[PDB]
Amino acid sequence: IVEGSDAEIGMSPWQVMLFRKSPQELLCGASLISDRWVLTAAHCLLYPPWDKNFTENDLLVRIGKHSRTRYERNIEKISMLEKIYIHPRYNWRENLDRDIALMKLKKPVAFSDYIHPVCLPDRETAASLLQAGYKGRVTGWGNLKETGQPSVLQVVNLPIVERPVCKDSTRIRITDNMFCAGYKPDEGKRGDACEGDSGGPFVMKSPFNNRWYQMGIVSWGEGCDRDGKYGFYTHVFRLKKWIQKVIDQFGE
């Protein structure tokens, strides 16, 4: 995250850390959607061009974290994946289209002041909140600067931008499974996700029922916080029918 701040304690209790067993290391962000399931970007697990193809075994899930680096002795819980599911039509070849994956935990986690799930949007909720101008919030332990790593979880509030402008800022082909967010060079406010923030949640708070909803997943971008550039996220509501599906077939 570029131009954000440290999160307050328990500000984002669905925030999950994707963690490598050896070298033990931060892979990506992700989010708690129930006591057994985690939501992240598919490219966090499968990205052939970087020779990336992680297995259930390659990792751990860290929930309830604040500190990037410390092992939060009575706060955080570490879990093991029972399985990984990637959107069958996720496109690593041309533009990270359908950048989405689900992870089923070996054992259901217990919620706490620091551990609590995010809601998935319904058609009406998405209908009304995914509007150009409306702000969302992103969190992650990622790069602070395009060129480093924070000590604590970072947060930023960013406005959704019109598809036209999103499309006109880049050479890459944008699909309906993506939305972009950031400020306009004239709006004079900064911030963005950045390398290492991948897989993290872009959430909105409903004004109707005052619940926090997850609308996007941190996907890709061009540099971090550059004028005329915007962060791109996986449009969670559009890939919902796929999510429903796998949960209904493989668990809970």
Binding site: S22, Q24, L60, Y71, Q149
Partner: peptide, 10 residues
């Protein structure tokens, strides 16, 4: 610069 996690997790 990651602090060690409990063996029990690995």
């Amino acid at each position: 610069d990651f602090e060690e996690i409990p063996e029990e997790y690995l």
